[PDB]
Each structure stands twice: as structure tokens, then as C-alpha cells.
Swiss-Prot record, chain A:
This enzyme's EC code(s): 3.4.21.107
Membrane topology: Single-pass membrane protein
Disulfide bridges in this chain: none
Domain PDZ: 216-261
Record note on domains: The PDZ domain probably binds peptides ending with C-terminal Tyr-X-Phe sequences, which activates proteolysis. In the absence of OMP peptides the PDZ domain inhibits peptidase activity.
Positions annotated as active site in the UniProt record: 55, 85, 160
Function: A site-1 protease (S1P) that cleaves the peptide bond between 'Val-148' and 'Ser-149' in RseA. Part of a regulated intramembrane proteolysis (RIP) cascade. When heat shock or other environmental stresses disrupt protein folding in the periplasm, DegS senses the accumulation of unassembled outer membrane porins (OMP) and then initiates RseA (anti sigma-E factor) degradation by cleaving its periplasmic domain, making it a substrate for subsequent cleavage by RseP.
Native source organism of the sequence: Escherichia coli O157:H7
Protein name: Serine endoprotease DegS
GO process terms (BP): cellular response to misfolded protein; protein quality control for misfolded or incompletely synthesized proteins
Chief localisation class: membrane
Gene name of the record: degS
GO cellular component: periplasmic space; plasma membrane
SUPFAM superfamilies given in the database record: PDZ domain-like (SSF50156), Trypsin-like serine proteases (SSF50494)
Record key words, sorted: Cell inner membrane, Cell membrane, Hydrolase, Membrane, Protease, Serine protease, Transmembrane, Transmembrane helix
From Swiss-Prot, chain B:
Subunit structure: Homotrimer.
CC per GO annotation: periplasmic space; plasma membrane
Subcellular location(s) of the protein: Cell inner membrane
UniProt xrefs under PANTHER family: PERIPLASMIC PH-DEPENDENT SERINE ENDOPROTEASE DEGQ (PTHR22939:SF101), SERINE PROTEASE FAMILY S1C HTRA-RELATED (PTHR22939)
Protein's name in the database: Serine endoprotease DegS
SUPFAM superfamilies, alphabetized: PDZ domain-like, Trypsin-like serine proteases
InterPro entries associated with the record: PDZ, PDZ_sf, Pept_S1C_DegS, Peptidase_S1_PA, Peptidase_S1_PA_chymotrypsin, Peptidase_S1C
Description of its domains: The PDZ domain probably binds peptides ending with C-terminal Tyr-X-Phe sequences, which activates proteolysis. In the absence of OMP peptides the PDZ domain inhibits peptidase activity.
Family: Belongs to the peptidase S1C family.
Amino acid sequence: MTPASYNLAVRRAAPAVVNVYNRGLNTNSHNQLEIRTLGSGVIMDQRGYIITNKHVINDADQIIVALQDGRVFEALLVGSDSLTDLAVLKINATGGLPTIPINARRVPHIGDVVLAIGNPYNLGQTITQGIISATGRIGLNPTGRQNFLQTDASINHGNSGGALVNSLGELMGINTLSFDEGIGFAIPFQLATKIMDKLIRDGRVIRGYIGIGGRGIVVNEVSPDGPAANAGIQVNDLIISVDNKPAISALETMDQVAEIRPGSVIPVVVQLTLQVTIQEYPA
Amino acid sequence: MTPASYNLAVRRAAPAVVNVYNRGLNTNSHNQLEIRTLGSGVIMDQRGYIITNKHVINDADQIIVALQDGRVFEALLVGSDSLTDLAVLKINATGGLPTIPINARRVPHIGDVVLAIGNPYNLGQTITQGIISATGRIGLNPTGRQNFLQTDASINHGNSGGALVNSLGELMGINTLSFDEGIGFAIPFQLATKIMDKLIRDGRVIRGYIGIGGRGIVVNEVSPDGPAANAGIQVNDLIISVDNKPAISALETMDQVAEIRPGSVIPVLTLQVTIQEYPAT
Amino acid sequence: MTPASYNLAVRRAAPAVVNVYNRGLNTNSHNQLEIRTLGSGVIMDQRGYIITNKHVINDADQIIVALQDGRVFEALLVGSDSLTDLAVLKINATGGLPTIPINARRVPHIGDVVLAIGNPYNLGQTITQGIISATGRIGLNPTGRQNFLQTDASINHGNSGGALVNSLGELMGINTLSFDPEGIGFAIPFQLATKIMDKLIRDGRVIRGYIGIGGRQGIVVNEVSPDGPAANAGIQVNDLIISVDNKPAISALETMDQVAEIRPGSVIPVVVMQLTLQVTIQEYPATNHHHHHH
């Protein structure tokens, strides 16, 4: 017979999970480059773009990336995002690079078997398995850990920034050491992809803000003094059209707003059409 | 090729797992119902019965149940049992209720893949995967967590009182934290079912108690003047037969004793013994 | 539609996993064999040899083994090995024994599903599942936890000395509590455990060949310990080894594992760069200092 195994997922995806090293110049008294932090990362494509955790590369003076095939490269930071604890690096790829399998049409399901791939510097590349416990949201509106992907695969320091893949080796998400026990989190791959593209284009993730709450949609708390204030909007009414389409849920409405570029003026129903200019999510 | 997955089990079972909120008036003073303890529960049937843990509902003064589909209900406490940390609730079943898949003929086996489904109101409904490490006894004589079903599927607070199902979505047990590292406990579903019915029938679990720790069956203790001392029972003699059936093993006889109602007199020479309700905990 | 299950692996392998009890005569204040330390062990074959952990049987005044089917036996300590934390026990059972399924041709793969079977006397036989996170090395040459097999199957006190098996019930390794580790367990790869057990059965201890080199179409000497088989012969520091005992000297690790396998006292030819040199291999420097870093 054939022993049950997830080796196919490993062979397919593991070569694209790298070791990421944050090194500093003022870490020791002799001003010699020294490791301050370690982590994992995922090569996204052949141009040399790698996704890792922001907390892994914070304040580094030199970022080194090491691959399983032995190659070592210095990486450049292209940008980071505190809300997702994601950062994007850029290595100068010569001779081709291994890249993570991705299936943009695949829809992750609660209960899908998942493998967490991390290259802890304390024990070599490691793999652990669990399942997807909650799928998380892929929109740009920040809502906290409860909306990241959750899994019971062991996620720890030698995993963080590494990959979460299904049994086919396809990228399900980017492992991230906690947020907000026995449960780990990851940024859904669909959001991790959107964030990387935004970080390459602009050097930061620009989100659309409107300062409103609720749960038609009832404006529960909308007095952040943001845009919703400097326009037609009371602290106790019900909005209808987010812009030109129904405002079912608050969550599924803050995502539309997040994608709206700052400076844009849109029509917020409530039926006195009061226009508002979207701002850039607070620092 | 399709990704390996236990989503089938999830689709079938998760809608039947609910959040349970234990509110309390004499929570801090305004004398207003403040949420004191959260938990999970399993909707068992269309009559609206729900199984959760006894620790979740202790001192509630008001219990609320929220289903994954959004509906919220006030719940009636129909009974609870300390020995198994189970409690039964009942809610309005009018509009139809999602129910947990259950197969009474399904024999659980060590090695079976199981999913632990808990509805914590902090990170939402969470599903974890493991296997059954030990099947546990389904008898009524209380013994201890050791005889409960054991699994390595993460069992925590946002799980406690929730469901443990197999890959078909069928109920294997009810997750319980602890009350007779890496391993969690659950009440086997066959015991949970028997406990729930006894609670519906009498409002409490009534257990037979003879008081003969037979560690044939070699007796070993009958000191608390138990209904054994008050009959033809020594202190270190064996037991060839009880209630008229064989006396093969001790744990299968104690579950048997706990199954006969208190008062009744049966043959245990032969000084017809009288079973008396288990000692109130 | 039958539920997903690893019960088959359980039925084949769990019977071979036993409880091991280590007692001592001066445990209490009455001078009676008092259960000190517990553990698990695995019956490797019908003759009655059993593998368990060294730390479980250390300082044992009497070792007893209890099988799942009830049978209970007193056991003989045939030997142990600190480096791998393994020990071998022997029990005389004339009525047939349940043995662990073993397939010497199976090659373990990273991602293979595994079950950790531990027979503790606190919760009964325990079974947990995970996968192989890293396969580990199988040579005799000392290495430390980093090269044992790694798994996310949970490895604790009630597992140690127990079995790690694949979904067919075949032995992948022997569970061992850490070495050299958060939610990661270690096991001695079965190929290594089998070699160790054979050596313990024959010699009562593991005898490893030593050549005295730390050299990382040839090998580059890094160090040449004082008074070692290499030190006391043609070898100083930057010498290029072409082959040892007339065998292509490709890798340092392969060559070191090859030396560990050579009986001490043997005299072998070591080609360097042309320059043939006769070296008499010694026993591996006796020292329980290997996993300390000190």
C-alpha cells in the first residue's frame, strides 16, 4: 500500500520558502553587522519579490535571504504594512528562482488540510500540519486577528513569514505570529497578493477611510470627526448606497471604502444625497 | 486533483454548534444581566434540545444561545450533571433548527479522524483536527476523565461544550475541559445521549449505587455502611452473579448497578440487596 | 462513505507498544522496589528484544515490562546508548509476542503522516497524529537532536520510548524527549535505532570507530584533535583526504559515518594529496559531553 502523506505539497512548495535575516550595524559595540532577528519568507515570482512579516524586518540595516538550494542574496525592502504585519522584499535574481505555487481561482474552505512551512534557523526547514479553522476576510479594511485565516497547524517563530499551503502545494496564506492558544494566524493569500501589488506600485498600502460604524445599514457610531463628519451624516441614522451599490453589511461596506482612493468624493445616501471626500486611513 | 479536506464534516455539523452565554443580574451592581461566562453547545434534535457543559451554565440566572445562522434564543435549563460536566438546554424549535448529524450504530475507533467544533465569541467558530486517542466508556457509573474519550484535536475554552465529530460529520462526543497537555477530553456521544434523556425524564441523573469497590469480582471496601454493608456482603469476598446475570468484570457490573433505579431489591448464599441512589455530590 | 481513520495503523502497531517500569530498592525508607520512573518501549521482534529510552531505565534496580494484552514480564537490560538516548531490554516470552511492523525498504518522506504511540500509566495507551517534519540522519556518527527525525505529533513523557509509525503501522522511529523545540517532537529514525539495537545486543554498548578529524573530490581537514588516530600520524590541518579505507572520500559526514562503523583497532589506508597513510582506528572518545555544547 501507499503510506498516507503530504510529501507532494512539500516537494512542490518548500523550495520557495526562504530564511530571512534582519541584521544591524549598531547592535554590538564594534558596529559589526549582526543578526537581530530571523524569520521566513516566500518567493512570490521570478522578479525576486518575497513576502515576509513586517516584524521580521523592522529597523534592519541589512536583510539577507537564504534559499534551500544554498543561494544567498541581499534583499531590498520595498514596503511594509502594520495592519497585516506583511512586508515585501526584492532580491536581484540571477539564474532563475523557485516560486511558490499559487492558484488564484482556488477558494479556501474551512476544514482544508494545510501545511505550514517555516525555515527556523534553530532546526532547518520544518513543516507541520493542521486544517483551516476559519477562512478570514480578503478585503482591505483592517479588522483585527479574528478576520485573518486561522489554523491549528503549529505556527511559531521559525514559521513566521513562511507559507501555509494546501495538500496540492498551493499557497493558502502567509503565516504570522499571532495578533489582536493552540491556534495560529495567516494573511489569506488573496489579501497578501493585493497588499504586495499595492506595496510595489506605491511604497505603502493606501486605504480609503470614512469614519463610521454600525451593523439597510444603521450608523451606530460615526463621529470620528473624519470625513463622515465634515459632510451630511448624523451620529444615529441609516445609510443606504455606499456609493452606487447596496450597503448590506458594515464589514462588506468598509472594504469598498478601503479601496476608494483618497480625495475621492462619493454619494452617501442617508434620502438627502450628502457627498463626502474619503480620507487616508489614520497613521 | 482536489485539496485534501474535511469541509464535508464542517458543512454538515457546524451549523448545529452554538454559542452559549451565561448571564447574570448580580454581575457588577446595576443589577443588569452581564455576560459572565461563554461557551458552546450542540443542538441535538428538532424538539430544540441542546447539550453544553455544566460549568458554562453554573449560576447563570439567564442563558442565551446564538446559532451560526444569526438567530438568537433564550434557553431553558432542563438539568445538569456534575460527574460528566454536561447540561441540557431547550430553546424554541418553531422555525426549524439545524441539527447535529448522529448515527447510533456508528462504532468509534481509536485512530478515527475527528474535528473539534467550538463557537467562541472572541474569534468566532473555530474548527480543529485530530484523531481519537482512546474511545472511553459509555456507562453510567462515574469513574473519571480517564474513561472519557481522549483526542489530540485542540480542546479549549472556545470549544468546551462544543462538538467532536468524525469526517462524515457524525457526533462522536461533547468536548469538556475537565472534571471526572496535548490531549483533550470529550464525553462519548453514547453517554451524552443517555445523560440527556435521563435529564429530560427526571430533571437530574439518577444513578444506582451499591458501594462495593470490587478491585469473579473481588470486593474490597464497603465501609460507609453502604447498601452493601446493610446486606449479605463481607469486605473481601467475590461476586459470582448480580441481579441474576454473570459477574465477569468489575467496571461492567458497576455500570450495570448504576443502571437500576434506587430502592429496588435484587439478588447479589444470596441476601437480596437494595440499590440506593448514588451519593449526592 | 466510511469515516477517515488511522485505526488500521493502530491495530497493527499498538499491541507492540509497552509500559516500562523502572524501580529502585532504596526508593523509599523501607527498601522495596518502588516504581520510580515510567516509560514506553517497543517490542522489535519475537525473540523478545525491546527498545525504550535510556533515561527511562537509568539506575534501575529492576525493570518490568507490561504488555497491552495484560501479560507482565521482568526484563534484562542488555545495554544503552547516551548519544541516541536508546536502551534495549530483553524479556523471555514463550507464548508468542506482538511485534512492531517494520519495513527496512520503506523510505520515510517529509510530510508522511505518522502516529505517536505511547503507553503511559496515567491515561492508558495514547495515540496522536502528525506528519514527518524532517527525516533526520541514520549513521552512527554523533550529531545531536538537529539530525533526529522531527514531527509535530506531540512527544511527551507518556510517549517517550514509544513508537512513531506511518499510516500502514510501520515503524518510522522511536520517540525521544528532546535533545541537542516548541511544538516539535523528536524520534530516532528506525534505520538508526535498528543498527543501534543490533550493536547493543552484540557488545552490550555501542562501539564507534573514531579517526580524529573535523574536516568540512576530497575532504578538507579543519581540526586534528590531540593524540588521536589522525593526530598520531600523517595529518596536521590543511591536508586533502582522497579516500579512507580505500573508498571515495566524497562527503565529510558520509566518511565520518563510515569511520564510526569501523571496529576500533583496525588499521586502514588513508590516501591524502599520492601519499598513502596507515591509521589505526580507536574507540570513540568516551564522553557524555556531546549534547551540552560545553
